Amino acid sequence: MHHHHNLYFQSNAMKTVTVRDLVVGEGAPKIIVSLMGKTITDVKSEALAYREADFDILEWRVDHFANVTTAESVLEAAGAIREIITDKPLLFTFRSAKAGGEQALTTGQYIDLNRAAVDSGLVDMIDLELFTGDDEVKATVGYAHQHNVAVIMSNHDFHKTPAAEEIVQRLRKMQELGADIPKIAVMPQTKADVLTLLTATVEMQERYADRPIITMSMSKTGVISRLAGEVFGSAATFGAVKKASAPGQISVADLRTVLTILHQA
Amino acid sequence: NLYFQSNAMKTVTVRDLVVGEGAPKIIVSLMGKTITDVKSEALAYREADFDILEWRVDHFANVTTAESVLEAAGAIREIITDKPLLFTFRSAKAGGEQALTTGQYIDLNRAAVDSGLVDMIDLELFTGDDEVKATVGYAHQHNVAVIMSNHDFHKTPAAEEIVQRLRKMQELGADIPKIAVMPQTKADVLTLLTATVEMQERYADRPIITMSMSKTGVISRLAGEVFGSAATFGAVKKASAPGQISVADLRTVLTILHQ
Ligand SMILES: *[C@H]1C=C(C(=O)O)C[C@@H](O)[C@@H]1O
Ligand SMILES: *[C@H]1C=C(C(=O)O)C[C@@H](O)[C@@H]1O
Ligand code: NI
């Protein structure tokens, strides 16, 4: 029902997504960092400071923003970020409280928030949570694609790590719903749980993926999952600039140092 | 020579170094054909940032001449005076450069033990239970620690088989069980890590060393602190086995992961 009177590319065959000249799914894993300001002032200060860091993609964690339900405030903040970080893809992510975030919204507010984000032309990608429901997600994925906005579809488990087979199925379901980059984060209770997440990454990437995926086992115990993306198949990884946006992230500089070492011939 | 061991703390202590605690320890291999090659390598290694020095005796040309081996070991100990020295004759079947009869091999190791010049010896599990068990006891009677090793250069066995081999090594009295396997797929690397974790949590009363070889398995050489391998091999100049990275890069990752 959306009619028309940013531009990213995607190669199913090469299993890549290209957003502003960044080729996700090729070479060393790409570094994403989260900006988490409460007010417009905080968001601007963070954007200015982050410009010094070496990252590939900038994720705006909109759930940390106080005026998230004031449309004009959201847009001023996005614009401000876009004006400072002009050469990197900008990912818009409202993470719900049960998925690790800081606030909660109704399904209606959440869909409306992402649509406004997509309509703005200020962001290159949006994050859509799988638990939002198949119908709503499928429609919003289509809406994003109609405006040349890429989608990272995400799923989280903060209590435990599901069986490898179940992790693989959720990644496939996200792909089937049209996600450009399926993403999954799970919490290990044991060291074996970390290996279960990596097993699933390898299985999905090798047998079903026709696009990049992002995976992680959270907490210090799972840090290897944020470093070994190149060999096991995770196309991107999160680093902390000054504060982690999820448990287990290491500093952006140390992160780049490790990824480079592992990329070396 | 006087090394300590604590089954309670699952540690092995050689010349002030505590294997089994903190970040994994870095071992490097010294490979020289003649005694002068050994002195050259030892002089060049003297600088490097490693914790244990492994002399790969299978690279030594005069391995069957008792006096040459003693002179080579003494030369190494004259130059590298503070770090534990590990005596390893790695057989051709297990990636070594030469082959010896069982008798020559056992005698070579007893002589090394007798010299007081080495702090540890490597014994290959598949040498024979009886010969291995006797040589472990012999080493222990002279305050020499034993790394017991097994290698599989063509494939990675099931995790459970990896676990049983590490348990057998423990059963035979190895101070540090060691296993190295070759990945043919990505899953194989994870299989080696699974085995390390399972052994560590459920059976180990001492430190273990594990590795998935080749560039594909390099992550196994870097994540020992979390998964449970107590030491890892790095290359000063040339790799003593496939997958090893430079000592500088190795130390860099180990530090980043410890903090
Ligand atoms: C997704 C996952 C995160 C992580 O586990 O590092 C960080 C979070 O901000 C992203 O939305
Ligand atoms: C044991 C294992 C090695 C490795 O895989 O790095 C190197 C070799 O010299 C050791 O004896
Ligand atoms: Ni439109």
DSSP string computed for B138-165: HHHHTT-EEEEEEEESS----HHHHHHH
* Dist CA B237 CA B45 (whole Å): 9
Query: Backbone phi, then psi, for A74, in 5-degree steps?
Result: -55, -50
Identify the residue whose tokens are 């005076």.
Answer: B81
Give A23's strand partners.
A18
* Dist CA B58 CA B33 (whole Å): 9
Closest A-chain CA to B257: A223
Partner residue opposite B256 with nearest CB, options A194, A199, A250: A250
Residue A59 CB neighbour total at 10 angstroms: 22
Task: Enumerate residues 6+ apart whose C-beta is below 8 A from B143.
Answer: B1, B2, B3
Query: Backbone phi, then psi, for A196, in 5-degree steps?
Result: -65, -40
Confirm or reject CATH 2.102.10.10 for domain B1-259, answering yes or no.
Answer: no
Q: Is the CB of B233 under 6 A from ligand 2?
A: yes
Exposure string for A147-164, b = 16+ CB within 10 A, e = fewer: bebbbbbbbbbeeebbeb
Cα angle vertex A143, ends A141, A148, to 5°?
Answer: 90
Task: Enumerate residues 6+ apart whose C-beta is below 8 A from A120.
Answer: A75, A78, A79
Residue B60: name the closest of B88, B33, B89, B92 by CA.
Answer: B33
Contacts of A192 in chain B (CB under 8 A): 194, 197-198
Residue type, A210: D
Residue type, B135: T
Structure tokens at B207: 């430190």
* Dist CA B131 CA B143 (whole Å): 19
Residue A2 CB neighbour total at 10 angstroms: 10
* Dist CA A242 CA A261 (whole Å): 23
Report the catalytic residues of B.
151, 178
Cβ distance B186 to A195 less than 8 Å, yes or no, reads: no
| Mutation site, B185, B213, B247, B257, interface A, largest A CB count within 10 A | B257
Residue B105: name the closest of B57, B160, B37 by CA.
Answer: B57
**CA-to-CA separations, B137 to B13, B100, B123, in angstroms, rounded:** 18, 22, 12
Largest Cα–Cα distance of chain A, in whole Å? Answer: 55
Q: Is the CB of B56 under 6 A from ligand 2?
A: yes
Atom of ligand 2 nearest to the CA of B221: 6
Partner residue opposite A232 with nearest CB, options B186, B226, B257: B186
Residue spans of the domains in chain B: they are: 1-259
Burial of A244 (0-12, 13-18, 19+ CB in 10 A): middle
Residues of B with CB under 8 A from a CB of A: 186-187, 189-190, 193-194, 197-198, 201, 216, 218-219, 223, 226-228, 245, 249, 252-253, 256-257
Identify the residue whose tokens are 């859509």.
Answer: A128
Please tell me the distance in Å from A66's CA to the nearest CA on chain B.
Answer: 33
Residues of A with CB under 8 A from a CB of B: 191-192, 194-195, 198-199, 202, 206, 221, 223-224, 227-228, 231-233, 250, 254, 257-258, 261-262, 264
Residue A181: name the closest of A203, A205, A156, A214 by CA.
Answer: A214
**CA-to-CA separations, B166 to A62, B210, B214, B227, in angstroms, rounded:** 50, 10, 21, 15
Rounding to the nearest 10 degrees, give the CA dihedral for residues B76, B78, B79, B82: 100
Residue B243: name the closest of B153, B122, B123, B150 by CA.
Answer: B153
**B77 C-alpha vs ligand 2 centroid, how far in Å?**
21
Structure tokens at B124: 């290959």
* Spatial contact of B41 and B31, defined as CB atoms under 8 Å apart: yes
Burial of A138 (0-12, 13-18, 19+ CB in 10 A): middle
Judging by DSSP bridges, how do beta strands B85-88 and A125-129 pair with one another? Answer: unpaired
* Dist CA A124 CA A112 (whole Å): 17
Structure tokens at A23: 């080729």
* Dist CA B201 CA B217 (whole Å): 22
Q: Is the CB of B212 under 6 A from ligand 2?
A: no
Q: Is the CB of B3 under 6 A from ligand 2?
A: no
Contacts of B218 in chain A (CB under 8 A): 231, 262
Ligand that lies nearest to the alpha carbon of residue A237, given by its number in the listed order: 1
* Spatial contact of A125 and A150, defined as CB atoms under 8 Å apart: yes
Cβ distance B257 to A223 less than 8 Å, yes or no, reads: yes
Give A204's strand partners.
none
* Dist CA A87 CA A75 (whole Å): 19
Residue B87 in 3-state DSSP?
A: strand
* Dist CA A198 CA A105 (whole Å): 32
Query: Backbone phi, then psi, for A86, in 5-degree steps?
Result: -95, -15
Mind spelling out the 3-state secondary structure of chain A?
Answer: CCCCCCCCEEECCCCEEEECCEEECCCCCEEEEEECCCCHHHHHHHHHHHCCCCCCEEEEEHHHCCCCCCHHHHHHHHHHHHHHCCCCCEEEECCEHHHCCCECCCHHHHHHHHHHHHHHCCCCEEEEEHHHCHHHHHHHHHHHHHCCCEEEEEEEECCCCCCHHHHHHHHHHHHHCCCCEEEEEECCCCHHHHHHHHHHHHHHHHHCCCCCCEEEECCHHHCHHHHCHHHHCCCEEECECCCCCCCCCCEHHHHHHHHHHHHCC
Rounding to the nearest 10 degrees, give the CA dihedral for residues B25, B31, B32, B38: 0
Please tell me the distance in Å from B110's CA to the nearest CA on chain A.
Answer: 40
* Dist CA A69 CA A113 (whole Å): 8
Give B88's strand partners.
B56
DSSP structure string for B102-124: HHHHHHHHHHHHHHT--SEEEEE
Terminal alpha carbon distance of chain A: 51
Positive or negative, the CA dihedral A42, A44, A45, A47 is: positive
**CATH number belonging to domain A1-265:** 3.20.20.70
* Dist CA B126 CA A124 (whole Å): 59
Rounding to the nearest 10 degrees, give the CA dihedral for residues A221, A152, B186, A167: 70
Contacts of A262 in chain B (CB under 8 A): 218-219
Give A9's strand partners.
A18
Residue type, B166: L
Identify the residue whose tokens are 């070396």.
Answer: A264
- Kindly name the residue from A160, A183, A191, A243 that is annotated as catalytic: A183
Residue B240: name the closest of B164, B161, B149, B114 by CA.
Answer: B149
Task: Enumerate residues 6+ apart whose C-beta is below 8 A from B134.
Answer: none
Burial of A23 (0-12, 13-18, 19+ CB in 10 A): middle
Resolution of the coordinates in A? Answer: 2.0
Partner residue opposite B197 with nearest CB, options A191, A227, A261: A191
Closest residue CA from atom 3 of ligand 2: B241
Annotated catalytic residue A156: yes
Task: Enumerate residues 6+ apart whose C-beta is below 8 A from B130.
Answer: none
Cα angle vertex A132, ends A127, A134, to 5°?
Answer: 105
Q: Is the CB of B214 under 6 A from ligand 2?
A: no
Count, residues in chain B:
259
Rounding to the nearest 10 degrees, give the CA dihedral for residues B121, B118, B70, B233: 60
Residue B250 in 3-state DSSP?
A: helix
Task: Enumerate residues 6+ apart whose C-beta is below 8 A from B52.
Answer: B14, B17, B25, B26, B27, B28, B83, B84, B85, B86, B120, B231
Q: How far is CA B183 from the centre of its chain?
A: 19
* Spatial contact of A148 and A123, defined as CB atoms under 8 Å apart: no
Partner residue opposite A257 with nearest CB, options B223, B228, B256: B256
Query: For residue B176, what is the enclosing H or E element?
Result: strand B176-181
Judging by DSSP bridges, how do beta strands A57-61 and A30-35 pair with one another? Answer: parallel
